[PDB]
Amino acid sequence: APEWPMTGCPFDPPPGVRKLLAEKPLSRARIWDGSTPWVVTRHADQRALLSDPRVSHDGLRDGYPHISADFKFLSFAGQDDPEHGRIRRMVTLPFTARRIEAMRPAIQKITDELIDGMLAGPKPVDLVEALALPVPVRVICEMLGVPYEDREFLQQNNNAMIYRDTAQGDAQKAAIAQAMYLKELVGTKLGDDILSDLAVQVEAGEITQDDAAGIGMMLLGAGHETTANMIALGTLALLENPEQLAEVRDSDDPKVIVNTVEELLRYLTIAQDTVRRIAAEDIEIGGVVIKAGEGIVFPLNAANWDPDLYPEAPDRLDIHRANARRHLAFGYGVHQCLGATLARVELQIVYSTLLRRIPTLALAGTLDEIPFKHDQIAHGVYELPVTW
Ligand code: HEM
Fold first, then answer.
1. DSSP per position, 24-54
2. Which terminus of the chain is more solvent-facing, meaning fewer CB atoms within 10 Å of its CB: N or C?
3. By three-state DSSP, how is residue 386 classified?
4. What does altering residue 274 to A do?
5. Taking the domain 1-388, which CATH number applies?
6. Is 203 exposed, middle or buried (0-12, 13-18, 19+ CB in 10 A)?
7. Is 4 helix (H, G, I), strand (E, B) or coil?
8. Residue closest by Cα to atom 39 of ligand 1
9. 3-state SS assignment for residue 93
10. Cα–Cα distance between 108 and 353 in angstroms, integer?
11. What's the CA-to-centroid distance between 331 and ligand 1, angstroms?
12. Does 15 sit behind a cis peptide bond, omega within 30 degrees of 0 on the bond before it?
């Protein structure tokens, strides 16, 4: 059983992963804890399994293929229905299309302010620090109903939980600080925002104040690093594909920014193999039998380069790929990304505004000088020096 997970093509999935996808759609791999879960590479099969009620997201179950030991420790996103949906229903409305369309001015203002700071400051500048990290956490603060004046505090806490050079002890203090704060804010709300909605539930007896705070925390975590990685990696992908950058920037067709975000989501699949399940019952698929209690690993980045679905050079960026929106970058089934509409719309605004306001944007060095997050689960770059 090969080890899992398996450099000068840094955007591309690992070579062994492309090999599996091509010749062993379903196979076993040994992960960090010595278990050998199934690896499911095909887009079709990921959809099949992820929407099969025999497939469980319950990380307390023996066999569950946790991403790493730390994720194992932590152990609504890690639960099955009915409790998963009971909780998800309480935070569904603010993420719906209409409500996210209604956030466009707020996301646009956040973006323009941060581009104002870039443009007043030195160059080159790290796009990660200047834009990619601040936007998503600021947007989520606003949906939560975090007062403007506590913004920087929540941002630094959340940043601290993301940095490689934060010592775990400090990351945990930062996490403790977020929870205490959110719990306090929920007590306060007892507004229009998520925490007010959650305060209603608290007041109704449906969840505790602690639970309210945990949900808040979870939305904070979930929506931050992922979106940041997309901002930074997505920008870099555009800068490495200049003819396509120019089009996204300069096209008069509003569909192009829309397509570009989907093709970026598909091309980069930053959530990689973070999607994990366990079979609750035996499941027969693709001529093998996944047995009850066996783990299942979903390399979304394999599915999104699947030639059954993306036959025309899926290993190249093509913003006109007519098919891109079929990607599974936000996963699939009942745990499909709650923020998927928000993310789409955040990236449309960030990429378009970044390129229209900084039409001379340029990588300050070259691709090979960029430090990628090869050593992590979520794909991305530690730093992105840009100039103009
Ligand atoms: C590029 C941006 C994003 C990507 C690639 C992404 C990816 C994903 C993926 C793959 C999952 C599925 C996890 C699983 O099945 O185990 C997921 C779930 C989730 N995402 Fe995102 N996400 C993004 C942005 C956001 C944002 C902006 C938010 C919230 C504000 C968010 C909140 C969530 C939540 C709450 C879940 C759990 C859904 C559930 O279990 O019912 N995400 N995301």
1. -SEEE-B-TTS---EEE--HHHHHHHHT-TT
2. N
3. strand
4. 93% epoxidation, 13% hydroxylation activity on FD-892
5. 1.10.630.10
6. exposed
7. coil
8. 335
9. helix
10. 8
11. 8
12. no
